[PDB]
Amino acid sequence: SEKYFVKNGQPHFLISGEVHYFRINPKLWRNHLQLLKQTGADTVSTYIPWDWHEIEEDDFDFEGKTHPARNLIRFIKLCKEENLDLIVKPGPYILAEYENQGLPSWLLKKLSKNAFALDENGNVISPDLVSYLSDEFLEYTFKWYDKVMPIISKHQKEHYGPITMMQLCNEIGVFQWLSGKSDYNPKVINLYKEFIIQRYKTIEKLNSVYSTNYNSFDDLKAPSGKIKLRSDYCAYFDFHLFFREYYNKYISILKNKIRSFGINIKLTHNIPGWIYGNASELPMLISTYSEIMKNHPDIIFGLDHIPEFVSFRNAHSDLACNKILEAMQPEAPVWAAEFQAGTREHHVKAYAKDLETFYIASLAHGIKGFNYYMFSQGINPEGKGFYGKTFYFQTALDAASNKLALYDSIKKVNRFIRKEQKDLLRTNVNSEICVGFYKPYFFTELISSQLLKEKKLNVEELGLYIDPRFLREEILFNGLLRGLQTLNYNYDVVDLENCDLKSLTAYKQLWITSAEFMDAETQNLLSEFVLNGGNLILYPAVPTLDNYLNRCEILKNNFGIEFITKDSSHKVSAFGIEDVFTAFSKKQIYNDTNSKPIAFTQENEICGIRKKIGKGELTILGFAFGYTSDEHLELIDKLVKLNKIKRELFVSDKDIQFVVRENNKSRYIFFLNYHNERKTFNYRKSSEEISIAPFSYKVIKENK
Amino acid sequence: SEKYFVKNGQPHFLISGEVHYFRINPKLWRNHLQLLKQTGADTVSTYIPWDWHEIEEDDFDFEGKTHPARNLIRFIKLCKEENLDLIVKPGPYILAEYENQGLPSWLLKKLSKNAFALDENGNVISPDLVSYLSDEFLEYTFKWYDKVMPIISKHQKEHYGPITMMQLCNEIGVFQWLSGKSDYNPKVINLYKEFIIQRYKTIEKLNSVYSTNYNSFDDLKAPSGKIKLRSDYCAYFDFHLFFREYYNKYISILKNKIRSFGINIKLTHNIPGWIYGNASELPMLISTYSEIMKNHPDIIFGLDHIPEFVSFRNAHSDLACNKILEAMQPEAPVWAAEFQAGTREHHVKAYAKDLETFYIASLAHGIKGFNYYMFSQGINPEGKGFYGKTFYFQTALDAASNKLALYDSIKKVNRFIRKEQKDLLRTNVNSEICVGFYKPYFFTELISSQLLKEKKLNVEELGLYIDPRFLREEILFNGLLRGLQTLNYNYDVVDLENCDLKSLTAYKQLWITSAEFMDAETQNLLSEFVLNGGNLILYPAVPTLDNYLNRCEILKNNFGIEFITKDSSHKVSAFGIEDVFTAFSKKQIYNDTNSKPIAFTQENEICGIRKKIGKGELTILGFAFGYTSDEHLELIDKLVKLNKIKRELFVSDKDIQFVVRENNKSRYIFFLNYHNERKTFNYRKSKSEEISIAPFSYKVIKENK
Numbered sequence A: 001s002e003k004y005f006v007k008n009g010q011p012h013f014l015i016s017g018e019v020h021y022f023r024i025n026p027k028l029w030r031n032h033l034q035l036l037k038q039t040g041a042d043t044v045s046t047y048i049p050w051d052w053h054e055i056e057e058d059d060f061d062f063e064g065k066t067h068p069a070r071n072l073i074r075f076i077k078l079c080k081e082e083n084l085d086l087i088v089k090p091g092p093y094i095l096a097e098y099e100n101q102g103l104p105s106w107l108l109k110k111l112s113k114n115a116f117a118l119d120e121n122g123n124v125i126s127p128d129l130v131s132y133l134s135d136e137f138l139e140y141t142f143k144w145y146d147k148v149m150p151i152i153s154k155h156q157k158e159h160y161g162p163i164t165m166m167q168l169c170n171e172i173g174v175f176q177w178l179s180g181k182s183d184y185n186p187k188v189i190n191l192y193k194e195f196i197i198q199r200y201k202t203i204e205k206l207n208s209v210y211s212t213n214y215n216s217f218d219d220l221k222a223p224s225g226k227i228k229l230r231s232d233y234c235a236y237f238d239f240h241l242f243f244r245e246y247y248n249k250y251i252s253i254l255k256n257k258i259r260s261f262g263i264n265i266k267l268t269h270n271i272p273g274w275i276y277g278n279a280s281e282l283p284m285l286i287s288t289y290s291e292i293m294k295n296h297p298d299i300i301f302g303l304d305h306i307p308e309f310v311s312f313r314n315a316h317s318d319l320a321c322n323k324i325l326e327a328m329q330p331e332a333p334v335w336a337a338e339f340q341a342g343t344r345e346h347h348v349k350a351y352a353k354d355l356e357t358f359y360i361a362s363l364a365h366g367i368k369g370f371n372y373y374m375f376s377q378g379i380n381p382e383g384k385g386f387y388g389k390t391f392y393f394q395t396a397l398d399a400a401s402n403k404l405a406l407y408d409s410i411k412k413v414n415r416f417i418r419k420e421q422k423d424l425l426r427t428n429v430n431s432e433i434c435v436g437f438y439k440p441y442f443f444t445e446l447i448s449s450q451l452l453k454e455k456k457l458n459v460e461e462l463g464l465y466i467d468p469r470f471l472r473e474e475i476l477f478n479g480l481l482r483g484l485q486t487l488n489y490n491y492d493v494v495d496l497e498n499c500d501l502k503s504l505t506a507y508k509q510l511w512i513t514s515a516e517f518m519d520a521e522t523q524n525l526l527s528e529f530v531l532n533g534g535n536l537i538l539y540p541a542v543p544t545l546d547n548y549l550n551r552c553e554i555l556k557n558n559f560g561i562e563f564i565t566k567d568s569s570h571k572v573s574a575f576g577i578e579d580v581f582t583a584f585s586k587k588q589i590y591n592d593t594n595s596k597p598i599a600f601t602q603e604n605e606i607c608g609i610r611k612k613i614g615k616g617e618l619t620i621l622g623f624a625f626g627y628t629s630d631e632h633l634e635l636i637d638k639l640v641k642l643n644k645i646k647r648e649l650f651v652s653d654k655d656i657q658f659v660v661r662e663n664n665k666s667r668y669i670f671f672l673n674y675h676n677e678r679k680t681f682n683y684r685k686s687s688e689e690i691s692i693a694p695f696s697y698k699v700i701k702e703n704k
Numbered sequence B: 001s002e003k004y005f006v007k008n009g010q011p012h013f014l015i016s017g018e019v020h021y022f023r024i025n026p027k028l029w030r031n032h033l034q035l036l037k038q039t040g041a042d043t044v045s046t047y048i049p050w051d052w053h054e055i056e057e058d059d060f061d062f063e064g065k066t067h068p069a070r071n072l073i074r075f076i077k078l079c080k081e082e083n084l085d086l087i088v089k090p091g092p093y094i095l096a097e098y099e100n101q102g103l104p105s106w107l108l109k110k111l112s113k114n115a116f117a118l119d120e121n122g123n124v125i126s127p128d129l130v131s132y133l134s135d136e137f138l139e140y141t142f143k144w145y146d147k148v149m150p151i152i153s154k155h156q157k158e159h160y161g162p163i164t165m166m167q168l169c170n171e172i173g174v175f176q177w178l179s180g181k182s183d184y185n186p187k188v189i190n191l192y193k194e195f196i197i198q199r200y201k202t203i204e205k206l207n208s209v210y211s212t213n214y215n216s217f218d219d220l221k222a223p224s225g226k227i228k229l230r231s232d233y234c235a236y237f238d239f240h241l242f243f244r245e246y247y248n249k250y251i252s253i254l255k256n257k258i259r260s261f262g263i264n265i266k267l268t269h270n271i272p273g274w275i276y277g278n279a280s281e282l283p284m285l286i287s288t289y290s291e292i293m294k295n296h297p298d299i300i301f302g303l304d305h306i307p308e309f310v311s312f313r314n315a316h317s318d319l320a321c322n323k324i325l326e327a328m329q330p331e332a333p334v335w336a337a338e339f340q341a342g343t344r345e346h347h348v349k350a351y352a353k354d355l356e357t358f359y360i361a362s363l364a365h366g367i368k369g370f371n372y373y374m375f376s377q378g379i380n381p382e383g384k385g386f387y388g389k390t391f392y393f394q395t396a397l398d399a400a401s402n403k404l405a406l407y408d409s410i411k412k413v414n415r416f417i418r419k420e421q422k423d424l425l426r427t428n429v430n431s432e433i434c435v436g437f438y439k440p441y442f443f444t445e446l447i448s449s450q451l452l453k454e455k456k457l458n459v460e461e462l463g464l465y466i467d468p469r470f471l472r473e474e475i476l477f478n479g480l481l482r483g484l485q486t487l488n489y490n491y492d493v494v495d496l497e498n499c500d501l502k503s504l505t506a507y508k509q510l511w512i513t514s515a516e517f518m519d520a521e522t523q524n525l526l527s528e529f530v531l532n533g534g535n536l537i538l539y540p541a542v543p544t545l546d547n548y549l550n551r552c553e554i555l556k557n558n559f560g561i562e563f564i565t566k567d568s569s570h571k572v573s574a575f576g577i578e579d580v581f582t583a584f585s586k587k588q589i590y591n592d593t594n595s596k597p598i599a600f601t602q603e604n605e606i607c608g609i610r611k612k613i614g615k616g617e618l619t620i621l622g623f624a625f626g627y628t629s630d631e632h633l634e635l636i637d638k639l640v641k642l643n644k645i646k647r648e649l650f651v652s653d654k655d656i657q658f659v660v661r662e663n664n665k666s667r668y669i670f671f672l673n674y675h676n677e678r679k680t681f682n683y684r685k686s687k688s689e690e691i692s693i694a695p696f697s698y699k700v701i702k703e704n705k
Helices: A026-037 A072-081 A105-110 A135-154 A174-179 A186-200 A203-210 A230-259 A282-288 A290-295 A315-328 A352-364 A405-424 A468-487 A520-531 A554-558 A630-641 B026-037 B072-081 B105-110 B135-154 B174-179 B186-200 B203-210 B230-259 B282-287 B290-295 B315-328 B352-364 B405-424 B468-486 B520-531 B554-558 B630-641
Strands: A005-007 A010-012 A014-018 A043-047 A054-056 A085-089 A163-167 A266-271 A299-305 A336-340 A369-373 A433-437 A491-495 A509-514 A535-540 A563-567 A571-574 A577-581 A586-590 A596-600 A606-613 A616-621 A649-651 A657-662 A666-673 A679-685 A689-692 A696-703 B014-018 B043-047 B054-056 B085-089 B163-167 B266-271 B299-305 B336-340 B369-373 B433-437 B491-495 B509-514 B535-540 B563-567 B571-574 B577-581 B586-590 B596-600 B606-613 B616-621 B649-651 B657-662 B666-673 B679-685 B689-693 B697-704
Touching: A010 A405, A014 A405, A026 A072, A043 A369, A054 A105, A072 A085, A072 A135, A135 A230, A174 A282, A186 A203, A186 A230, A203 A230, A230 A266, A230 A282, A230 A290, A266 A282, A266 A336, A282 A315, A282 A468, A290 A299, A299 A315, A299 A369, A315 A352, A315 A433, A315 A468, A315 A491, A336 A352, A352 A405, A352 A666, A352 A696, A405 A666, A433 A468, A468 A509, A468 A535, A468 A630, A509 A520, A520 A535, A520 A554, A520 A616, A571 A606, A577 A630, A649 A657, A666 A679, A666 A689, A689 A696, B014 B405, B026 B072, B043 B369, B072 B085, B072 B135, B135 B230, B186 B203, B186 B230, B203 B230, B230 B266, B230 B290, B266 B282, B266 B336, B282 B315, B282 B468, B290 B299, B299 B315, B299 B369, B315 B352, B315 B433, B315 B468, B315 B491, B336 B352, B352 B405, B352 B666, B352 B697, B405 B666, B433 B468, B468 B509, B468 B535, B468 B630, B509 B520, B520 B535, B520 B554, B520 B616, B571 B606, B577 B630, B649 B657, B666 B689, B689 B697
Parallel strands: A014 A043, A014 A369, A043 A085, A085 A163, A163 A266, A266 A299, A299 A336, A336 A369, A433 A491, A433 A509, A509 A535, A535 A616, B014 B043, B014 B369, B043 B085, B085 B163, B163 B266, B266 B299, B299 B336, B336 B369, B433 B491, B433 B509, B509 B535, B535 B616
Antiparallel strands: A005 A010, A563 A586, A571 A577, A571 A596, A586 A606, A596 A606, A606 A616, A649 A679, A657 A666, A666 A696, A679 A689, B563 B586, B571 B577, B571 B596, B586 B606, B596 B606, B606 B616, B649 B679, B657 B666, B666 B697, B679 B689
8 A cells, every 4th residue: 555665675764864975974984974873864875976986088986096085885885784775866967056067167167058058049058057968068968977887786785785865867847947048959949849739730730729820840930038928838737747748858868878787776856945944935846856756667756854843833834735645646656855964055054952842743744764955064175065065954963973963863864764674664555536747838938927926827818817926826835735734634736647537446535636727627527526426526717728728618617607706895604604714806607507505705696506416516616715713724725624624633632733644453543743832732533631741742553 | 221011110011912802702801801911911902993893984882882893882881800901002094804804884885085195196005095194084083082082082091091001093194005005195295395495495405416407496396206316216216214203294283183082091002014024124113113103102013023933034023123123212111012922813823832932932032021913813793894703813812712822832931921020120231242223224114115116216327336125124223133143142222313323432442334335423423432442343335425316434444544446256254254145245445544353255355354443442344244154153263353243141052042041030041943943052141051952942041139
């Protein structure tokens, strides 16, 4: 049932620590590794920076010939001697606050202009930003691979070396997220043209979907600038699809090259997106990897969790991310490839007592393995740091291997995980609620994000009122998912793309946060789900358009729904809850023939109905709410209770969060106090009186 | 030397609690007032909502004829019976999470289009957002004042009523700021044209400053859209100067109207700007009040502090805000008109143990009075809540008057205040460091802010590289001021506008965070400061332009500086500190003439010097740093120590914050732990005392003599 790492044919909790040999005095390599093993960690993880080892063109030092900290071979030997497995990350990009993001200075100086990512005017975006599919870039990457990959191949577990996994590059696409800028390198744009011809076949077909007036594919230009027309939206939508395919073409080239060295170990990639201690943008970054995840069952994506603190302000972020990755990557364990230990930023403190609670919360929230990033602080050699001499602060170990406050917290958590892993890894939560993940709402990193200064997507110019990023961040991520977690209702997430109806029948309710657009396949899926006996909760809009903003009213028609969109006060009443604040003046007002009205505008127009369709049940709310009042928690609670869903426990203090994880034999109850208040409470199934410190936890075991 | 409130010729710490009579069962008003008085509070504060009392047009209820909680008159009488003084706040705007921000529904339905704030297209920005000088808006406002002001006048302290203070309107500009758009209403555009004609006299003089080619003032239009030319920047700069006059005209009209009722009590206004628990934009909002604070010595501005939590992430916001209000309003005590109690937002928790530390930190940080907002929870009657039925959570009292967890925290703090106020209010911190506040850098709410929808200002298009909002947010507010507080160096802030040289000579160092532009008056002031014996630290730029981006090289010439601007690595070395990360590739490279070079680029070019000039000292760094690395604290520490400034205490844990306040009689040592760590440390005045402090907690030590 559960997915988990395995060691010696038994469940294994992967405990890795990140230790950058190239940033640590080599006299202290053994001490760092011993102190890491002594916490109960089983694995160590590092970058192998191209710039650090190809010191000049075709001059490689992996043995400390030119700098003792270039002795990669010795570091691998010490990992083996100190009984740690090793994760290696040879790039070619490593980021990691390393100058030029790990690319050699000599390479960036030598590359032709056409090897760089270019803006729409043919100017170099950044002196350290190559075009991923540049011939010259891949030729040099391949020569780096020809030197580092034989070493990695020799030192795999197979050959009783320590190497058990390898990351390909680092956060593919990250520079487009950070800048909001696409690569317009003509070679990229040629691949985009081929993608469009492949997709539409004829200019007439393209013109019919986009409402363009092209005489041929020769008329077609890559989109740029603000979206003013529905045709611009269409072109940008497909440009996002193209980048997902392009990142798959890149990682496939690296993967096939790596496999040519007989490297048969597990391959990895990593997903960023936390900002200022919350992760509502991370699902957008998950969505950039949609094509890789479809085409590579053998590449495990892990999460980069950067909470910064642990409170009710961010309690919901890690769980939502873990659940969305599980939806998109069901056949691999959910693990944190970069699991905050200390802080990248001196002024952004990472307290041991916060991170200890985050580590236990992560267990509650289904994490199956993690890599403490950074377990060991580093000192940048020889000028090579982008930001200062020091790499991370408040780590488990400083760069000199001094133990810091976090060390004892990691040892304590690791001791618990080792004691419990055989049973804990085989537990799941009993979710009766399923929440739909509609990937096209997330396809906006070039047009609408938390990092994009000037928004290119303004849906009011397109004749729309529900912005997909507002919906996915405030109505879904910070709204419904935060509210369910706060109310201690389990949910699962499901990827609606190519979704199997049979998997939806497990759940008592499916929740769909819908904008005005949804593709035919998803409208058909939801239609069949209800007609066959499913209970659907759908808000804030019945969709009437497809992904290209062309008419598509399958779900509306199948469900017998009629509506007019009308302006009214932001507040509605719903299920007898007065003064429910909603996001929009515009609301769907429903015809109530064969329906039960359950929500009303200030002038008593019907903005929500319940209906029986076939064997199933529909609840439609023509208004948007997230979680910004107690009325929103009341409404989510009432909606869940329509299908008689119960929490696992009665807990006397509603502001205690709990997670019950179970299998046939074992139950774990995780109690999490995300508040600056000592809380005393009691619990029972739906003597037993417990006190939890501020920003703390308690784990109870029950035998069944 | 300290400014503080006075009652009967003695220092008085103003302790107010906000209690909304209109959101509380009137049978429980007395119980709320008694429980507030029992915390040691002396004052209660409330809005008087126009929508609540003018129930239809020209139908007024202040006596509970139509709803018991419209009985304002009984609430005033109960304040008197329960020995609480009263602050009243009749609007016209109140915000207060009240439908339509407090304006009557009947009003917003009746007003014509011209009464609203409009975008550059002519469209209504928000259906509750009026244009302040709208003739129609002011006519209805005056009719509301005609009914509420006689009541306020009758119940003033001078007539043995409880009313001691009144707020005019609420956070002027806040509704516009939150909308993310500026007001292009036609009353506004016409007043702007009069403003420009009065400022420049002839189109030729305007053209000489802006480098424009207008044939007449009739050709000049209110600036709109993005700044592409230095002349666009000039137009928007005057547009900012115009809005500061516009807000002064609004408050002036309200004040003159109020005074006509024989209302002689203290008038107030309240300052917005906290966002998600920090206040880096608050200085922008306070700068919009520049002309009010110059023209109205009798209107006391107070701060609206909304920390939400109390940690290292926002520790510097309240002190920086308190210091900037003191700079703009040096003749009145620094007070919080709204001092967070509970939370306005159910999903944004406010923990008693956080706010108790915030209260003590506020005392350390020089606060002289406050109004706990909200002391009492409310329930909206009759659907009046903007966002739900309940008004505030985790307050001192719930709407029923039950004590909640915060009540005992507020009683504890108030007890310490009442025991100590006679001495505590008279205490000062010994500030050897003065930081300059250059208001023009803040004048960007039309073009560049955290809330503005459209970024109109891109300095690179103007041939500049130092953005005034980046400088004031990251180099000054989150950088220098955060760094000085973290290092436990006391600083004062001084407004450079019409600044007296004698008010700068008391300090060992003056720190100026400078862009490439600075007016001739300020360039001249700083020149005289150093020539006369001042010690000046100036970065990241010697300015070479004035506020209209025209040539002004006064300070460069007076300091005998030559420089070229050159691109290099972000990293520099400064005072032997290697790998100091700086914000820009571009840096100032100084000639070494008659100077000591103290900072170097990766190509070892000189990007900082120190020199002696007349009787004074100059330290110039041609690179920008805030506080985003440990090297930045090292660099600030090195700079402070150039003039042998010392901390007041040796403390064994550098992450403990302290403030020493003293007068002739008493010394108070405030220790603040903004970190989630139980800390045990020792200290001594610069045999050591040992202290253990809880996470997110505080200690106060009083010493006699």
